[PDB]
Amino acid sequence: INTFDGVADYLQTYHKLPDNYITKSEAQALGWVASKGNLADVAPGKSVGGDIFSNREGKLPGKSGRTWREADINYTSGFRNSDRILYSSDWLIYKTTDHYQTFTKIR
């Protein structure tokens, strides 16, 4: 599952990202080399997702004790694309299609 709707629904319902996601640290460990654009070479079918998103430009809504995490969307192979899903600890879901420049709420 790696589509906006698909990951959005999965998260709200199962409260974890689907099995095709790995964090950046786990992908680095597995052999992911960002400037080589090789994720799909060292980890076919996998997307990076689950890392904490700091929210410093402060574009997404904050709240006492709320954490934001991210996951890449639409990724198949090559260099990571510009699409990301943003999900809080309390399950508000937002998406970005321009490298966190703008966000739209989707759930």
Swiss-Prot record:
Q: Could you say which enzyme class this protein belongs to?
A: hydrolase
Main location class: secreted
Source domain of life is: Bacteria
Q: Does the keyword Nucleus apply?
A: no
Q: Where in the cell is it found?
A: Secreted
**Consequence of substituting H99Q:** Loss of activity
The entry's cellular-component GO terms read: extracellular region
Task: Cite the EC number.
Answer: 3.1.27.-
Q: Which family does it belong to?
A: Belongs to the ribonuclease N1/T1 family.
Task: Describe the task this protein carries out.
Answer: Hydrolyzes phosphodiester bonds in RNA, poly- and oligoribonucleotides resulting in 3'-nucleoside monophosphates via 2',3'-cyclophosphate intermediates.
Protein name, UniProt field: Ribonuclease
